[PDB]
Amino acid sequence: TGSVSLDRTVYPVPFGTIADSSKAANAAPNGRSVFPIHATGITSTIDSTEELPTGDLTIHVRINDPDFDENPAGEDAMDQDNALKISVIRGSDSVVLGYAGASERTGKIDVGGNNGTISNIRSFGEMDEIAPDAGIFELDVNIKFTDGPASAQCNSHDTLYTALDGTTGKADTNRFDDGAASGQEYCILQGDILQVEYTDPADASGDANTVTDSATFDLRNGVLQSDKSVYIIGSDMILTLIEPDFDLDNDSAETYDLDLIEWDSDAATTTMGNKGVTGAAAAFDPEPTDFRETGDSTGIFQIVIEIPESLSNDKLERGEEIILEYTDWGPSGSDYVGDEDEDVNLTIYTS
Amino acid sequence: ANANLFVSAENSQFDNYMSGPQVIEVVVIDSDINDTDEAKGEPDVTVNGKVLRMVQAVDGNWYGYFADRDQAQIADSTATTADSGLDFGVFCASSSGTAALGFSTTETDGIAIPITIANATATGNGTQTGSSSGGAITTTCAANTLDASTANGTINVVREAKDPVAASGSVSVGQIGLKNGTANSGPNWPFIQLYELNPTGNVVVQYNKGGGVQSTTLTFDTVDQFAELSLDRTVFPRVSQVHATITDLWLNIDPTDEDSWTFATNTKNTTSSFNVDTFYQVFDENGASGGSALTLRTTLSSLMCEDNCVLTLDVDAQSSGTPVVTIQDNGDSILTQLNASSNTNANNASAFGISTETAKLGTGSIPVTITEQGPNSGVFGTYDESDKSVLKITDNAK
Amino acid sequence: RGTSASLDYNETPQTILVGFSFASIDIQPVTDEWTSGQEIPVVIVDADQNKNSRADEDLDLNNPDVTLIPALRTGDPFTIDEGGTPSLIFTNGTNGDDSIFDTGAINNTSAGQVGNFTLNINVTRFSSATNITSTESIDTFSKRLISAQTANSSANFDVDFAIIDLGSATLETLKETVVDEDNTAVGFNFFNYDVRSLGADTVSIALLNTTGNILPWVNNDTRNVDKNNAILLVSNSTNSQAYVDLTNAVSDAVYGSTNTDSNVNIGFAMYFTGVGDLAAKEVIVMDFFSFGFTDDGVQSSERFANQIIRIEAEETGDNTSTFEGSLEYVMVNQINIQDAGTFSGITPIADDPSFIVIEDLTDEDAPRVNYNDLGADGVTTPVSDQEEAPSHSGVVSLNADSYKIADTVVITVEDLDLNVDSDLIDIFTVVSDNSKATDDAVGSATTQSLSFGELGRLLDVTFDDVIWSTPDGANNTATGNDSDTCSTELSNAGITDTGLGATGFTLVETGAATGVFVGDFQIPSFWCRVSDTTTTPYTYAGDEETTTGLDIEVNYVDFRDASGEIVEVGDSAGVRAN
């Protein structure tokens, strides 16, 4: 009897860029699904250089069925056609993202897990053995911010859709087998459910069986902190950001722009990145160039900052008040990434 | 066998291996048959049980030369001009021995005689150039074949052969009956007796005399496990000589002479027509012409070369703009600066070439020459006897 | 299997039993970790490949009688079976005067590479008066087209062309491997072909795009529907086996078509010279490789490497069924990634192949070699081995904590990933080009501006947190307090060590495959400060300054740390005086 297991129990809600919405240009998200940089760095309307790149969730699915280990010292695959289903459900309504088990095919997302012809639906493709003698199989599937039941909350998104089919188009019909209701859009909200079901064609009794694992989408608010309160000018400070929203992939260490953090003081107000006041980026000497995870699955990001001498040709004083501000687009309060904001602050001193 | 029987391939360093189209000299030195004015009996010498015919020379010693049949044929096909590159001369059938040499060669797979064919008949006159694939030799040679020959001494794989003993009284030429005994410029001496040998198999040479037999066993196989290159130093100052030593059993084709090889080594010549290549005896061991340059690149697979017959050079490895290594003339080669413009200097390795051979060894395509340190040593070098290497470090090197 | 024959001499018969042997493949790492630029052996034991007890046998792709070959694959190569089982026909005839095979040339121009494909056929005296048609089959892992014919070797018989239909494949199928090379930050396309089995003198290969049928083929004169049908890849080459770099024109031609990709069908055409005969079986291999990154290349999804590698292992003895081979890989760094030389440098088909690693490969992504096998139970069951290819965190150090004027300062970098060749010493040199942002730094003149910094920069040396550079270029005209510019100001003090590029500083690997790089230089008495680093060339001050009382630092940028991410590391020391 096979088993199936998902990568994680809880997942961040994914977001998108301004290129996804057809809405008019604005200096704020304005109900769009974007994660802008701090406001002090934003030039007039939000443009491609003023938000984090597109945030697409990547999950990993593993099936532990020894019956597909025909070759005990050789590669195998799970070749049973459409034996794995990936679906997103919100209460009663359900959306099936695709199948795995068969040769990969261009298809559409299914609405309600209801569509007559399975050939119409997207197939992720045959899975592969992790090691020659393991008997464990793995799939990598990418989940965008548009993939889930239709809802009224997301009507604010003037969404242009990624055409899953061969054609080039930005309509819901190109990506979903059923058009959305008027005044509604397809999207993921906080509290949604991700499940995978495996149809084992041979169980312990020699017949068919269905095994399942489930997980939830969630958003959390960030914690920003430093190694110590007081710093000598020119010393190195360790800056830590705890945003679980950002561990999109467990396998890799994710990198995020340093313009998200605000530096405001008597000397100057700046984003501490490439979007700050002239010569501010060189004044901090970040190592590395921006935030980075402290491991594959931690959701903890660290950066090393040197306390400047002079930000904007104005030198810092002793005991000066410094505030670090991070705008967590997607707090606990928000339902999707965009929407509400919460500000997290840190105060530090020169000695 | 080291009492009276000497075989060229007998080398402890290389573990008695032989490979490729190389010719093997068998010498008998014995005091019982050392006289040259009396008709003593030919010594009885066999390879893999088949008779080897031995000619007496003026030093009172008995000589014989043999090679693998298919390797001689394949190598001979590269020699497009006569007496240049790997020419074994002309391939005759075993029956032709009596009519051509004047004595029987019937226990051999074939013979290679140094003449040229005037009348290229299908039957009675042998093959000048050999087969690229090899096989059985069936074309015969006759007495009228020798007389009609217009250029004698076309063998280039044996160049240093001792004079056959002369015909006086009861004694015939070479004491066994050669029809013309002028060595290395006549139509009969030297000649190579061809034998079909087994790759990865042993080759046994025997001499049968009163009181016991002397044997020597050799292996016929690819010999890239004995091949290596050594440099004189680890770190090189600015106007140093780069003294390179190559040891390769495969490169000793001539057992009696000093073997010379010339390489096109420029691995960054990107001209579509150009290829890294290997040439045989483009020079002598005394830096004379010694013949034309003939391609060997597409035939090295069929001559038992396993990654061991090719020299390549990169003058500027880091592409810094200043070339580290250049090339220069020495006593064992004739190198010329073909771009003599004032705009270039002696540090331009691509401004040197060979004047007589410009199609494949012209400007660019850095020619490099090696010479054998001893007639039958298998150890080659780029140095000459004045200690002047072909490869030198440039004066402005970084 | 299991059946036998009986041979008898001296009234004692002996059975000749037919049987199959289980195979075993195993990669053997010399030490704990397989790092960049190290050869480790690959050993296969299969008695079914020892078909001669008195000879040593090689697994050559080109020989149809070697039934199985080990193969390693990464990413998505475009092999000859990418659209299913191909269709191949041979033909005799002559090229038309408008054919790309007679008019084209490889000169990186649409005029040369892009054309159409027209030919005149004379197969009227051929057997049954039809073009030679073939039965096709494909290896599971080695991806080798084996075509079965009736063997013809007569003096009358001769062929000139081969046309392949690549099954269902279209430009959609091709475009998922071949990259744009104009709209990609770093991108290179490579074509790998082996047609040694045909025994040709010259070969020419062209890729065919069309909205009609690859077979039967039609000249432009009959079908006046398409502007161009052929894209030239190789022209009249003398190498039957080669691994070539495609020009920009080929990548420009693939993306240039106005028609939607699904309707356009793709196929191969070949031209031969000197194919006098065909054996009962012949093999053809044709692949597309691609290497590079997109955007910053910081995210994993943004780095790609598509390649297939075949091991032609050699029999150890005469009657030893053991077959020996090796693998080696080159880990990519910020310098070699920008050069097409590094990707064209690998040997895809050999007894000792090499392959490219774009990032840390562990767990499910570890490189694995597959060997299809016929077992003793008579069923075909593959055997495989994998080995991880980790990346290493680099450290850089300075030998002393304090230096004095004219003291030797020695810099060492311990990064195992920087060893790219096990036979040769690896060297990195300083850049001297006033028109590039990587000036007076260890790296490459070729460069790009990206998020993490400058892509052509690997190491540099600074006094007081400012780049130590020579006052040269167009922005060195400042005189300072007096009327003397900083460049002549240094020269009057007898200083020739004007910057890092002028000391001849280089990073040299201690051994052939040690992974430790060392450089050295001497501290100067005076130096010229950089006023503004945001301009190219840099703007230099008007007055020289003493180096005494300033800190000295070295900075190293690791393109691949322990996780395969970009990080910068450094060391510091103090210059003193008495």
From TrEMBL, chain C:
| Organism superkingdom | Archaea
Please give the positions of the paired cysteines in each disulfide bond: C486-C528
Q: Which UniProt keywords apply?
A: Membrane, Transmembrane, Transmembrane helix
* This protein's name: Uncharacterized protein
Organism field = Nitrosopumilus maritimus (strain SCM1)
Question: The organism's lineage?
Answer: Archaea, Nitrososphaerota, Nitrososphaeria, Nitrosopumilales, Nitrosopumilaceae
Task: Indicate the span of the full protein covered.
Answer: 435 to 1012 of 1734
